[PDB]
Design a protein around this ligand. Structure first.
Ligand SMILES: O=c1[nH]c(=O)c2nc[nH]c2[nH]1
Lengths: 876, 159, 609, 142, 48
């Protein structure tokens, strides 16, 4: 803070400054070269010569004006001083002056105050008003230099202080760990510091300014901080000639104001701003510290490059947007993307406030021709993508971006109808501003959702002008934009895997106030229904003419798929808006009302039919290649995922008849198709992966949750044995992720556990062939057999049987004995594996316990056993 | 002095219909005896056909706030915009309510308005809301002012 | 998700694990929040004095005219900026800084005597003159008008400056503001006032519930306290304080101008807008109370929300009281025909229920004190409504109708005050003092219940309610000294205004059985307040005899009863009746009053007990 | 997910992306992603290529690359957490927390509200005390 | 000077017409002032 022990302020600007500053680069102006790269940077100029001439001219002008001669350079004192002082101030801003030059110019400004440690300076020479304004600018720069020096000194002290504080905190942590056993009770209160966010830790560690003995900071560290704070206060002047820049400036401004009635409002404002700055030295630090960031040495070059890109982007705000400037700022945005400091220091990014700069750019681009089609849609998309990534970087960035929600929602209809521009719209920016943030989702207001609902209603009432201009059939609504508005509402109502009750209720109420947001169907007064609408979409997809414009997807929209996606998004939004089971059980009137509304809106039969709608399987053809239906131009399992979600959330499955009916209409065909798609060629197709994802995400977890409904199910044995066979075959099928395999395991285990023992005979027959291989896939069958035999040991061992279930048919006993002997032989002849043996041993023990000890080895084999269907690999 | 609606007062619920480009005044009416459903009785042709106001006259038995209604459901008022009222048929003695069943004439998401004996539940209660911007929530109900009634149970308007 | 926050708390990595630069940045932010911001120094008065001092006003060597001082130039610059026509009032950092400086310079801030009281009054007047002698009032009005009804830091700073220059009811500042407004016919000023008062916010129960959900789901508010509820309580209080200071001192010119602007093309009724905002804030308070009614205890966030709402309502009530004091008959009629009665009914219900609720709990003493201070302010406003009333007056009839509408709540309040006023003669009774032979002051719950049963003035319901309100102890003994100091002391202080209101209504409506019922309900409260309810008759400004009610101190009664004062009174009576002329009998009586006022003070000094 | 990546591994991701450099978008194609994955050390499958590739042309910019990398890798970051969790207290090696220490760690460090510890052990009487750090945390969360 | 919207209407033909006015009518500083207004308007430069 101070050059020596004598706490006297040094000359401003003189000293060691380490803060990052823009690089100074110039290009040689030559008209014989043809490089064309010299058009970056300003042309060169002799800076040393300019500095020396400026100093000499300023000295001469000061000495001449001290005589008050009637021959000023240029004819007037203004003409003599204003240009020269302007050039001098520009050079000082550039930082060309160094050491001796700064001393000389400071002595010229005021010889008495700026002594190094009959002559009058500029400040006391009866200057005109423009000269006074320029001197005010100069003194403002000097104050800025003082503030920057204070910031640098604060950081310099802050390092050693933080290092000592961290060392002492580690020492206290170690002593707490050592005294844990004796102290017991107070260990929690001592570790509360070690279990609070680092901001809170530092807040309490610094919470010792006045009394507040509740501070673990030791006396030496407290004394160091207090001494530095006192020194900083002394430097700021909080606590004989002027001897100080602050006193000199205050006296000069007061003297000017009380000597002349200033006719320049700009001069008055500058003078009083300078006076307030002198009297509010603490306020300078209050403004500067939030915009102060520190980095390590390794990040210096990357930070400099990022600052250069940000400076170019900021400078482009002062030029009218055109093709070249749009290209430049797109390149700068990409450079800021590529710079790794943008991801490492989101706090630095926010302090620089480049989100606000890009926001102003987007505002300018939209406002230019807001009435007509927006110019520079590429620039709008780039700005929106930058804001989305900035939101994704950090939660604090998301909160900062949340403040501009109103403008983004107002301009949410920028590029919704244009494909390939997803994630590059103001609606996408708003969705990122609220996505997966419970604070911001709860902070969402009702007018914002009302605006979104109004936009959705407009989309559902009126067609798309751009689409009908390109040539798409003129239906009476806008599914493409409606789907995006529904997606934003989904993000508003669903957060972190949980439904926001307030937002869900508000959205449902607005949707039922404006029924046109549900599309042409579900409006009533002639609406067909969900199932009829989706069948119509299937027909539209099948018929090319109503699908494309009919004058790489590129400009194609696939209007049938657009309608399907809109209805699926609406169904998913309503399902996520549905109330929860615990609230329904508690009996909340609002929850019951919302559930009744949704049940009346969407009939259960429509959901059942839409789920029962079949897909288009990929087909192998001649030349040994597969033809694959297009994902984007047809029905997709993502559509039925929304139906499953809504059916589970609103109607729910709580009765065996409905469970089994739904299984036999909608789920079993899909499981069978996915199992049939398990061959090597078809397994990598889009249909297969999408169907596997849909199954293991929606259908199998639902069956796992509703497994206990399989308790008394004797008559539908064929159905729920076909289910088991399809599940096992699909599990044996390859190209499945670990999560999908685990979901299959859990579903099959739960269903088999809740099933009756006497009716899993066919699954046992399938498993007795595959288990003895003891390959990687065998772990799930071993667990299944272990659990089954442990639960149903009485079904075999006791001659009477478990009860009304009965006893074995003696071919179940033959199969069990074959399974036991096969597993035993395989484990005997198999090389040791830890987990495989740890899973195989309980299975063998369970089968041995289940088998009656006096069971007769059937020399008379089962009744002309039918293994003709059974095969190697093919199995059928 | 414009009079204010006070609980023990008999009222008729009129509405305007511009059928075939001609204004008609229809009073909400109900029979109660053998016909729970409600209908509309024309009053614009009073000079040629006498209206039957005996089945149109309603009485405001109670006027309680939303919170008071919720408390009462859990376990001489003057009408204020925001209260929940109990409209009792003067002739039948039964109360206006939104019936659970609907005529199902493509309304789908709508119910029917009729009469029922029991005051239990929130079906019989209706909340008053102002018509235009001049009237606000929480001020007194005037005789000449228009209003919109919202069913408490079905959150639906008389339509 | 609270569980998610808990596991993140366990997974957190400490400072010594954190890298050096991250911890340095965090320490910089914490240091700025904790030390630099909290650092405070006082320079505003000295800076304003230096700016106001002219420099070399003899040596200028001009003699053409008196140059305007730097403070005058700054105020002129701000005034010209405000007067420059614009679509929106742009935010000006210089304006916030210097408005704050001048506002802090015009205040210069146990028991204080008369000499230093007028020392402070003279100093405040001089400091306010330093500003309003240079156009500060006109500049404040210009900034408020240019705001055009948009709330913001400009309007906040302008209102603070106006309050600073109007503190104490500055007659000169008021006259200057009125003269400027009448000369300019500024309808924009009143339109901006109406817009700001409409934009003022109230308690937001939905925002409170959302904040509670966020807190309960484990995520901690990294920023300060949730201000989404009662967005700008300080701004609302400052605005209504400025409005009150406009009419402070019964300044009838403003009292009428705020109601109606005679010389302007358009007129805005500030009185009606104020009562509308009072109705809004009362509704918010009632809804928030209904939210907390079911719960047995009120959390700290809820309690501080009650406190802020109570402060806002108290400021609005004080503003209305300043509007109607006078009397200002036009404002009185306007509020009589306004919706003030509904807000008063709601406040009465809230008071009647919240008193019973908060009396039982021992952690809501401050909230109870704030609430009953608000009740006292409301009763003061009602008395100011009754100012200037005649026998069988329309305002009296309306207020009796309001009491009839709030009959249940009024009866509960009266029972509350009777119940906590009988505590003195419960405790001081010898049947109670015998339970505590020593002066320690602790009494058992069983003993205190038995004494309350034996007193025969407390019914069983009152007895059990005071037992519930009694502070529990580990030894099951309560200090009745602290009990009475906590409960009876708010009585005899807030109940006095209720007693005065009831007496005024009874004497001005002699033929109202509806009010007679309340009189029998409040018989005991009036009996307690009889020794302290001073009642005189004066010759009113409306050329009618007006009865005046005020408070007499028991200390004043004792000093009046002291023998020396009695001897002085006897001598004075003989002097005036025998030889004292009837021409200056009132002059002699006032002189005797002043001498006795000094004699009673001297008697209080010399007496010791 | 409040900056779950640290400067170190984001920097190593930085050389991994810049090994092909070439203005960022250039030479960062579908084939390069597997090469950089198995230069870092993890082995994703061909499907584990195609899923990300068609979720995102074929040229991958650094923001999208780092976003997908962070999203996938924001897992298995509780190892050091549980290590420190059992190393802090209960050093007897039984791995079970006493009722007193359970109450002491529930004493909310940021909310400061009490007796909810006793409520949780009342609602989890069977778990009790004999409660282990890991299975406790996945029982206690969802 | 006033309308930035009207400044976008000015094109190469208009600028060359103004320069031809300079060429044909002689040296007029108001033409240079108009050119300065075309170059810079309200602190925003027009590169074209
Ligand atoms: O005007 C006043 N008259 C008095 O009698 C008095 N006593 C104290 N202060 C007083 N002021």
């Amino acid at each position: 803070l101070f050059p020596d022990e004598n706490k006297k302020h040094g000359l401003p600007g003189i000293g060691l400054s380490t803060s990052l500053r823009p690089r100074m680069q110039f290009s040689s102006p030559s008209f014989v070269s043809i490089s064309n790269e010299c058009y970056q940077y300003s042309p060169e100029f002799p800076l040393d010569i300019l500095k020396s001439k400026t100093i000499q001219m300023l000295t001469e002008a000061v000495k001449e004006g001290s005589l008050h001669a009637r021959d000023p350079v240029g004819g007037t004192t203004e003409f003599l001083f204003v240009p020269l002082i302007k050039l001098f101030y520009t050079l000082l801003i550039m930082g060309i002056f160094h050491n001796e030059d700064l001393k000389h110019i400071l002595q010229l400004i005021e010889p008495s105050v700026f002594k190094e440690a009959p002559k009058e300076g500029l400040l006391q020479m009866k200057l005109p008003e423009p000269v006074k304004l320029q001197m005010c600018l100069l003194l403002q720069y000097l104050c800025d230099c003082q503030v920057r020096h204070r910031i640098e000194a604060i950081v310099a002290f802050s390092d050693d202080f933080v290092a000592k504080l961290q060392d002492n905190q580690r020492f206290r942590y170690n002593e707490v760990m050592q005294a844990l056993n004796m102290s017991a009770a107070l260990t929690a209160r001592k570790t509360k510091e070690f279990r609070s966010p680092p901001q809170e830790q530092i807040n309490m560690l610094l919470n010792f300014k006045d009394d507040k003995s509740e501070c673990p900071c030791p006396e030496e560290i407290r004394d160091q901080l207090l001494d530095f704070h006192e020194d900083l206060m002394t430097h700021c002047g909080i606590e004989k000639k002027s001897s100080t820049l602050q006193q000199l400036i205050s006296e000069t401004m007061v003297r000017w104001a009380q000597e002349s009635v200033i006719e320049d409002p700009e001069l008055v404002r500058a003078m009083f701003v300078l006076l307030h700055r002198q009297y509010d030295g603490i306020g300078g630090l209050v403004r500067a510290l939030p915009k102060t960031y520190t980095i390590n040495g390794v990040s210096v070059e990357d930070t400099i490059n990022l600052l250069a890109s940000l400076g170019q982007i900021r400078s482009l705000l002062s030029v009218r947007m055109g093709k070249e400037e749009e290209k430049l700022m797109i390149r700068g945005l990409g450079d800021i993307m590529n710079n790794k400091v943008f991801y490492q220091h989101p706090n630095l990014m926010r302090a620089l406030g480049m989100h606000e700069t890009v926001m102003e750019v987007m505002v300018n681009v939209l406002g230019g021709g807001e009435s007509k089609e927006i110019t520079f849609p590429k620039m709008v998309a780039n700005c929106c993508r930058f804001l989305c990534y900035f939101c994704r970087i950090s939660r604090q960035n998301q909160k900062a971006m949340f403040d501009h929600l109103s403008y983004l929602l107002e301009n949410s209809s920028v590029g919704l109808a244009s494909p390939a521009m997803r994630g590059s719209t103001p609606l996408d920016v708003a969705a990122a501003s609220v996505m997966d943030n419970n604070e911001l989702a709860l902070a969402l207001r009702e007018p914002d959702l009302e605006k979104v609902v109004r936009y959705l209603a407009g989309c559902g009432l009126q067609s798309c002008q751009m689409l009908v201009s390109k040539g798409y059939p003129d239906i009476g609504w806008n599914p493409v934009e409606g789907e995006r508005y529904l997606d934003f509402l989904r993000f508003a109502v669903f957060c972190n895997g949980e439904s926001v009750e307030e937002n869900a209720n508000v959205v449902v109420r607005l949707l039922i106030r404006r029924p046109e947001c549900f599309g042409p169907a579900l409006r009533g007064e002639g609406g067909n229904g969900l199932l009829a609408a989706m069948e119509e979409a299937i027909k539209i997809a099948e018929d090319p003419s109503r699908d494309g414009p009919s004058p790489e997807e590129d400009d194609t929209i696939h209007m049938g798929n657009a309608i399907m996606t809109f209805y699926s998004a609406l169904i998913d939004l309503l399902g996520r808006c549905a109330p929860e089971m615990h609230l329904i059980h508690a009996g909340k009137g609002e929850a019951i009302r919302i559930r009744s509304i949704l049940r009346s809106l969407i009939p259960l039969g429509d959901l059942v039919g839409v789920i029962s709608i079949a897909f288009q399987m990929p087909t192998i053809a001649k030349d040994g290649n597969v033809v694959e239906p297009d994902m984007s131009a047809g029905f997709c399992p993502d559509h039925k995922a929304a139906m499953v979600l809504f059916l589970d959330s609103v109607y729910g499955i709580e009765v065996q008849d409905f469970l089994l009916h739904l299984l036999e209409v909608g789920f079993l065909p899909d499981l069978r198709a996915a199992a049939s798609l398990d061959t090597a060629a078809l397994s990598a197709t889009d249909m297969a992966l999408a169907l596997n994802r849909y199954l293991c995400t929606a259908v199998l977890p639902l069956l796992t949750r509703c497994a206990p409904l399989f308790a008394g199910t004797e008559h539908h044995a064929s159905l729920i044995d076909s289910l088991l066979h399809t599940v096992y075959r699909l599990s044996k099928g390859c190209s499945l992720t670990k999560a999908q395999r685990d979901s299959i395991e859990v579903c099959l285990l739960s269903i088999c556990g809740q099933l009756r023992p006497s009716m899993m005979q066919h699954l046992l027959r399938r498993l007795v062939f595959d288990v003895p291989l003891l390959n990687e896939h065998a772990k799930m069958p071993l667990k299944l057999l272990t659990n089954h035999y442990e639960r149903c040991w009485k079904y075999y061992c006791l001659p009477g049987g478990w009860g009304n279930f009965g006893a074995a048919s003696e071919e179940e006993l033959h199969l069990s004995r074959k399974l036991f002997w096969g597993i035993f032989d395989a484990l005997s002849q198999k090389k040791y594996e830890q987990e495989l043996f740890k899973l195989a041993l309980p299975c063998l023990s369970a089968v041995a316990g289940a088998l009656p000890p006096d069971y007769m080895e059937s020399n008379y084999v089962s009744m002309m056993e039918k293994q003709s269907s059974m095969d190697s690999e093919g199995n059928f | 002095e414009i009079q204010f609606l006070r609980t023990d007062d008999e009222v008729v619920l009129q509405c305007t219909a511009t059928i075939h480009k001609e204004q008609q005044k229809l009073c909400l009416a109900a029979e109660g005896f053998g016909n729970r459903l409600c209908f509309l009785e024309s009053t614009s042709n009073s000079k040629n056909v006498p209206p039957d106001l005996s089945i149109c006259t309603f009485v405001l038995e109670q006027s309680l706030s939303v919170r008071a209604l919720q408390e009462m459901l859990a376990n001489h008022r003057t009408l204020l915009y925001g209260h929940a009222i109990l409209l009792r048929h003067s002739y039948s003695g039964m109360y206006l309510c939104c019936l659970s069943t609907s005529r199902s004439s493509t309304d789908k998401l709508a119910f029917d308005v009729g009469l029922q004996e029991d005051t239990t539940g929130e079906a019989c209660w209706w909340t008053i809301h102002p018509a235009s911007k001049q009237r606000s929530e929480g001020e007194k109900v005037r005789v000449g002012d228009d209003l919109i009634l919202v069913s408490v149970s079905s959150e639906r308007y008389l339509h | 998700q609270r569980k998610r926050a808990v596991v993140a708390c366990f997974r957190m990595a400490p400072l010594y694990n954190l890298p050096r630069h991250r911890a340095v940045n965090l320490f910089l932010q914490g240091y700025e929040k904790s030390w630099i911001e909290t650092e405070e120094h006082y320079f505003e008065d000295k800076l304003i004095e230096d700016l106001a001092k002219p420099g070399a006003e003899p040596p200028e060597e001009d003699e053409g005219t008196k140059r305007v001082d730097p403070l005058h130039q700054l105020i002129l610059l701000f005034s010209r900026t405000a007067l420059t026509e614009k679509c929106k009032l742009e935010e000006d950092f210089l304006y916030m800084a210097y408005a704050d400086i001048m506002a802090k310079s015009c205040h210069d801030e146990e028991v204080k005597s008369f000499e230093e009281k007028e020392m402070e009054k003279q100093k405040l007047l001089y400091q306010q003159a330093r500003l309003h002698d240079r156009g500060a009032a006109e500049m404040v009005l210009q900034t408020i008008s240019a705001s055009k009804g948009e709330t913001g830091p400009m309007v906040a700073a302008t209102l603070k400056l106006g309050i600073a220059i109007l503190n104490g009811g500055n007659s000169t500042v008021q006259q200057k503001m009125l003269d400027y407004l009448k000369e300019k016919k500024d309808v924009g000023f009143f339109q901006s006032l109406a817009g700001l008062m409409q934009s003022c916010s109230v308690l937001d129960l939905n925002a409170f519930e959302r904040q509670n959900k966020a807190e309960g789901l484990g995520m901690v508010t990294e920023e300060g306290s949730g201000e989404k509820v009662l967005q700008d309580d300080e701004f609302t209080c400052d605005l209504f304080r400025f409005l009150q200071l406009l009419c402070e001192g019964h300044n009838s010119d403003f009292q009428n101008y705020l109601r109606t602007q005679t010389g302007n093309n358009t007129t805005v009724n500030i009185i009606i807008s104020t009562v509308d905002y009072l109705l809004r804030v009362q509704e918010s308070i009632s809804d928030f109370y209904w939210y907390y009614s079911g719960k047995d205890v009120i959390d700290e966030q809820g309690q501080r929300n009650f406190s802020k709402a109570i402060q806002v309502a108290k400021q609005v009530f004080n503003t209305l009281t300043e509007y109607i004091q006078g009397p200002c008959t036009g404002n009185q009629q306007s509020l009589a025909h306004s919706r003030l009665w509904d807000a008063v009914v709601g406040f009465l219900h809230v008071f009647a229920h919240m008193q019973m609720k908060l009396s039982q709990d021992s952690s809501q003493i401050e909230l109870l004190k704030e609430l009953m201070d608000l009740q006292k302010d409301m009763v003061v406003m009602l008395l100011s409504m009754l100012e200037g009333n005649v026998v069988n007056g329309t305002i009296g009839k309306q207020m009796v109708d309001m009491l009839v509408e709030s009959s249940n709540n009024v009866e509960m309040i009266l029972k509350f005050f009777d119940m906590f006023l009988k505590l003195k003669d419960l405790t001081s009774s010898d049947t109670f003092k015998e339970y505590d032979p020593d002066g320690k002051g602790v009494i058992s719950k069983r003993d205190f219940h038995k004494a309350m049963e034996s007193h025969k003035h407390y019914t069983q319901s009152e007895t059990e309610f005071l037992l519930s309100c009694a502070e529990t102890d580990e030894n099951e003994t309560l200090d009745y000294e602290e009990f009475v100091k906590r409960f009876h002391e708010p009585a005899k202080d807030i109940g006095f205004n209720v007693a005065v209101l009831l007496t005024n209504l009874s004497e001005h409506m002699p033929n109202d059985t509806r009010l007679q019922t309340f009189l029998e309900l409040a018989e005991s409260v009036l009996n307690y307040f009889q020794p302290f309810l001073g009642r005189i008759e004066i010759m009113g400004s409306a050329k009618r005899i007006e009865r005046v009610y005020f408070e007499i101190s028991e200390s004043s009664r004792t000093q009046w009863e002291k023998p020396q004062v009695k001897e002085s009174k006897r001598q004075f009576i003989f002097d005036v009746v025998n030889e004292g002329g009837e021409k200056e009998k009132m002059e002699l009586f006032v002189n005797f009053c002043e001498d006795t006022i000094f004699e009673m003070q001297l008697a209080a000094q010399i007496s010791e007990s | 997910m409040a900056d779950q990546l640290t400067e170190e591994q984001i920097a190593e991701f930085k050389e991994a992306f810049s090994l092909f450099d070439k203005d960022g978008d250039g030479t960062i194609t579908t084939k390069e992603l597997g090469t950089v994955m198995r230069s870092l050390g993890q082995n994703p499958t061909e499907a584990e290529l195609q899923d990300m590739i068609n979720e995102v042309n074929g040229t991958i910019d650094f923001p999208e690359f780092l976003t997908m990398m962070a999203r996938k890798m924001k897992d298995t970051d509780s190892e050091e957490e549980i290590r420190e969790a059992f190393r802090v207290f209960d050093k007897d090696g039984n791995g079970y927390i006493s009722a007193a220490e359970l109450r002491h760690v529930m004493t909310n460090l940021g909310e400061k509200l009490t007796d909810e510890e006793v409520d949780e052990m009342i609602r989890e009487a069977d778990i009790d005390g004999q409660v282990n750090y890991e299975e406790f945390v996945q029982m206690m969360t969802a | 000077v006033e309308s930035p919207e009207a400044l976008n209407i000015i094109k190469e033909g208009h600028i060359k017409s103004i320069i031809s006015l300079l060429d044909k009518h002689g040296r007029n500083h108001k033409v240079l002032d108009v050119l300065c207004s075309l170059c810079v308007c309200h602190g925003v430069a027009v590169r074209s």
